[PDB]
Amino acid sequence: TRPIFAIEQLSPYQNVWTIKARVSYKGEIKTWHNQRGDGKLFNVNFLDTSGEIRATAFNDFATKFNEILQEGKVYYVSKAKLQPAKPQFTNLTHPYELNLDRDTVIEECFDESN
């Protein structure tokens, strides 16, 4: 479990890092008819001072992931597939895409004691 890194430090090969940020805009949940599979999928956009990023998750994995994370607040996310997006492709600068499917860990800003 890598520690929290700036959005620019995200890596697709690492396939295991941590990033903290707040939510900016929520997309929705639509199905994805793959050539040999089908299910539900949803996409959400998270904003952070380090830069702008977007998180997306698959079927039930997103339902359990979006339910934990809230709206209008800050939180942390780790153990997820990192996919960098092209800048010109999206109006946003340094757009980042995230695919959730395997075992990922997310937690809204909660009070921790230790």
Curated annotation (Swiss-Prot):
The N-terminus is blocked. It is found in: Nucleus. It comes from the Eukaryota. Component of the heterotrimeric canonical replication protein A complex (RPA). Interacts with POB3. Belongs to the replication factor A protein 1 family. Present with 4100 molecules/cell in log phase SD medium. As part of the replication protein A (RPA/RP-A), a single-stranded DNA-binding heterotrimeric complex, may play an essential role in DNA replication, recombination and repair. Binds and stabilizes single-stranded DNA intermediates, preventing complementary DNA reannealing and recruiting different proteins involved in DNA metabolism. Binds to single-stranded sequences participating in DNA replication in addition to those mediating transcriptional repression (URS1) and activation (CAR1). Stimulates the activity of a cognate strand exchange protein (SEP1). This is Replication factor A protein 1. The chain holds residues 181 to 294 of 621 of the full protein.
